[PDB]
Symmetry: D2
Subunit: 256 residues, 4 copies
């Protein structure tokens, strides 16, 4: 209730899924939270539910939406301590020959450039507060995934960008870190599975891809984010894996 | 004060340095802590200072000392939730030709096999409590260090062993993680620097090896350990870097 | 002279620097090489110098240039075995607040989407030949670099995309790998250094960033590419570091 | 036939499996090779088969055997250019509680300290020739394996030690690299599979653990070793993965 008291946090894509879990974790740590989302439904309800959270409609691909997000956060709360760049999307499975450069550009706009834009607009305020940036990347940026060339590329970019920005902002006392979740049970996961021939088999395989034998929860990503914001004062440029061990060991992926 | 309430933690090498910082962090989180050390001086004083911590003399290279450590922890506190394998040593700088197989074996006994032995003896109790293991490795296991072949090898072993054991213990609900610190200001760091021709220059270089421009503190490693024990329920087999960004970018290490 | 005899290779950005070194290495291995470049000067001279190499003017950011590159390679040589995606650029040092989303998009077009486009257009022919893709990424995609947020992000994307595509193309026998060079002495390196206040000091620091004490040569990247094409039949999705050890150890990047 | 002509190479464990593949690759590159093995059967036959290879009986865990190996190589051939530390063993699957500290020490003696000892004794000669060291580690040192805590730890140690030694030997022009194979079809693989309830199912799973859908060959590890010795002049401290993509993507390893 006090580990991040007095602090102001912006969470993009905070209306459902991982983002909502991060919002809840920060509120529970004593922070005031601005929920940014392009969809009103979840975020508005979350603002009614949580004292200490408010909702601002903002599409992170629209530069003027993001400018207004930052200026309204400062106008309403007087400071900015942490930006969590969580908004992102995973397209349906797509074989490489079924992808397009224009779909790839669109996905870069959301998963990479939206993170870049908010971070850039927020950094002057983060420098004043010795605040920090937390980017939500993905394990698959590090190890790859099948039928997801554009998505994987966007997350490799986010993880790398996190390290570059950590170097650039270190002289100013602003830490920049990322979290790479594995399979987290969210509405995106449920929507992707529903597209498959056997959604139940897809979900079962998703649970068993982790040594821990289940998928992760938004609250577990949220606790990692609160740690990075509030207690990881010597961590910058790290990639914190929240994956249940999926990257470990051999699996289902004589010498001729 | 309550994030790890009711839990029992063993910290090896807990009498000074990083270990003492981890002890303090766990006590502050509400746990009872057993301080294991081969040196009475720091650990006994820490037991007097901290309600909730007690000291047990134990050299982790001596199997019967470790057996007694575990059986006394259970006899006195009734459960075991977390083992922090922190005891270890860094020899003075040694060029490869100045090392010996027998010095290498001795360092393996402490930095690797002591961690192995306590973990093995503790695992039956950790399974009962769905507890966890935290090994203190080192950034240099991942990236190397000059004049430290044996030390580097021992830490590469610890980090790898953490992943193997995480796979083996996942079916039983026991997580196994490691922390890889960079330069942390401790009595070991101070003792190593005092051996150098210009200790002050060695310390200054140590501070500047991190983008953050300072060395880390035992309390920062301690906060990472408390996160891994108490809030990282979907993390297993991870290497949590607490290094101030030392692994990032180019440094001081035309084409002929 | 025979390790890649009978094979046809396309090298983008092959007119100078690393690309020209890769062209020479493949010609020396017995392959026929198509030099792609947006600049006529170096590539045309290279075509006159090397029997077995020909030059095709092609800007990899222009989809119809790339379509013609592939169709002319097939029309003239009857097969395609290897694509080396080397074309790319490093902007001058830019602090994060001096970058723009539109500059970032432009750099993505070259360093990431040009690689994507040629690969996509080439893959039907690579499947027929059980050929392979080699992407030239950068060490800084993995470890970060200062004053280079957009560049670093593009190379993290390339390395990640390499892994995704390796997964997707494995059933078809097409390997996809990348090379991550460190400091290689090329016209780009020389042009960037000339912008600095003391170019000589910048170059000296560049040599000393590697434990080997020099920068690398285009011929060394070329030999790595020939290995990946011709002899690495069980390697797919790898990142082959050609960096002189720059990522190893501590450098120039008490606890307060 | 000439890429490593005039050079002298020592391959430990060269009598069968990967080691024999490395021996053959170096002979085919024009080098003279000393086959070291503790077993006479395979190595003696290989010496009869290959002009340019000779067999020396040597157990790498016995320091005086290794001293004689080096002194006989110099006496007979006048120089030493490359050491390949391939000798090693994988115990049968062992749950953590079934391992022992004394078995762990024994495995460290072979997989880690034998590599250390030969390297140390060879380095004075490698400095004279600006030669290089190649250690055969394992992918599982990096990602873990189930039922193999001691083996995994030994290979994490080898990979880390490679980086440390690369730093130490860089001023002297001696490169130190490792190869991390995945599943390679060798007599060790066949012997381990024969211990399983269904050896055929174990082998089938082993083939399918790689995106490439087969296991690797000793000749493929051998080609990687020849590349590292003869053409990778700007590579030091690298871990070259020869794994068929096993580390990529998700596999067989809702949120409660
Ligand atoms: N779920 C997983 O398994 C998983 C794994 C790894 C990484 N991730 C990453 O975690 C993040 C959140 O994923 P999730 O599963 O919670 O997704 P989700 O679809 O359940 O929730 C995403 C939220 O972001 C919002 N959003 C989307 N586009 C936006 C835009 N342009 N501007 C503002 N808000 C926008 C959506 O409206 C939604 O509320 C994403 O970056 C995703 O890539 C998810
Ligand atoms: N200080 C750093 O910069 C740094 C960096 C990376 C990793 N580490 C690791 O962190 C750990 C702690 O290092 P530190 O700097 O705090 O060291 P330290 O020497 O200051 O403290 C180590 C403690 O361990 C105890 N210990 C040593 N051998 C023991 C044994 N056989 N049995 C029981 N206790 C024993 C010592 O008595 C001491 O109290 C070590 O594993 C070290 O390798 C330290
Ligand atoms: N030089 C280094 O230290 C270094 C380090 C790591 C990675 N790299 C990468 O290696 C690659 C080559 O770098 P370099 O140093 O040789 O650069 P360079 O500038 O010396 O040569 C690049 C070549 O690519 C061509 N090119 C540029 N844009 C193109 C386009 N749109 N279409 C076609 N050709 C185009 C240029 O005309 C030139 O001939 C780049 O991808 C770079 O990011 C270089
Ligand atoms: N086969 C795989 O899938 C695989 C995968 C990753 C790593 N590796 C590593 O590759 C190396 C070779 O493995 P392999 O599968 O070819 O094994 P193998 O058992 O088929 O051959 C090993 C050879 O080393 C010799 N050897 C063993 N102990 C020795 C000693 N004390 N002194 C000298 N020689 C000794 C054996 O007699 C034998 O000829 C090992 O280090 C192993 O850990 C193998
Ligand atoms: O970033 C990630 C996003 C994820 O979303 C989902 C959800 C359901 C299925 C899939 C999926 C699995 C295999 C291939 C593929 O293209 C997928 F989209 N990903 C899953 C894991 C991640 F690390
Ligand atoms: O595990 C580590 C242990 C460390 O201890 C120290 C302390 C002072 C100096 C050194 C040191 C620096 C360079 C070479 C060397 O051999 C050293 F011991 N390490 C420093 C960093 C780590 F990641
Ligand atoms: O991809 C790379 C590209 C490189 O180009 C150059 C050349 C000269 C200077 C720099 C440079 C150094 C520090 C910061 C920065 O922004 C630079 F551009 N990079 C150097 C290393 C790489 F890995
Ligand atoms: O170093 C390695 C050594 C290997 O040997 C073998 C051979 C057959 C089975 C196994 C194996 C598989 C799963 C668990 C386990 O304990 C094994 F030994 N490893 C396989 C892969 C490696 F990377
Ligand atoms: O839709 C899948 C899951 O999404 C998560 O974000 C919600 O917190 C869960 O209640 C829900 O089951
Ligand atoms: O000796 C160096 C440092 O060691 C740390 O463990 C102590 O907490 C500090 O008070 C001390 O300055
Ligand atoms: O311009 C720097 C260097 O670029 C390389 O590509 C050329 O091969 C060298 O001859 C030149 O010195
Ligand atoms: O025993 C399994 C395999 O081992 C390899 O080292 C040999 O080259 C193969 O001929 C054999 O099939
Ligand atoms: Na509210
Ligand atoms: Na006490
Ligand atoms: Na020509
Ligand atoms: Na012979």
């Amino acid at each position: 209730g006090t580990r991040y008291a007095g602090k102001v946090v912006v969470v993009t894509g905070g209306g459902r899924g991982i983002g909502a879990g991060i919002v809840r974790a920060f509120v529970n740590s004593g922070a005031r939270v601005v929920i940014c989302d392009k969809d009103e439904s979840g975020g508005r309800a979350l603002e009614q539910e949580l004292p200490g959270a408010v909702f601002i409609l903002c599409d992170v691909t629209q530069e003027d939406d993001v400018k207004t997000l930052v200026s309204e956060t400062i106008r309403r709360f007087g400071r900015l301590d942490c930006v969590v760049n969580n908004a992102g999307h995973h397209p349906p499975p797509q074989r490489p020959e079924e992808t397009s450069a224009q779909g790839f550009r669109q996905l870069l706009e959301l998963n990479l450039l939206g993170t870049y834009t908010l971070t850039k607009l927020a950094l002057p305020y983060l420098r004043k507060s010795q605040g920090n940036v937390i980017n939500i990347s993905s394990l698959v940026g590090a190890i790859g995934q099948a039928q997801a060339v554009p998505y994987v590329a966007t997350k490799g970019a986010v993880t790398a960008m996190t390290k570059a920005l950590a170097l650039d902002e270190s002289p100013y006392g602003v830490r920049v870190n990322c979290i790479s979740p594995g399979n987290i049970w969210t509405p995106l996961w449920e929507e992707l599975a529903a597209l498959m021939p056997d959604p139940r088999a897809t979900i079962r395989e998703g649970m068993l891809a982790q040594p821990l034998g289940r998928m992760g929860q938004p609250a577990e990503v949220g606790a990692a984010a609160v740690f990075l914001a509030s207690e990881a004062n010597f961590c910058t440029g790290i990639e914190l894996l929240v994956t249940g061990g999926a990257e470990l060991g051999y699996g289902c992926k004589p010498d001729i």
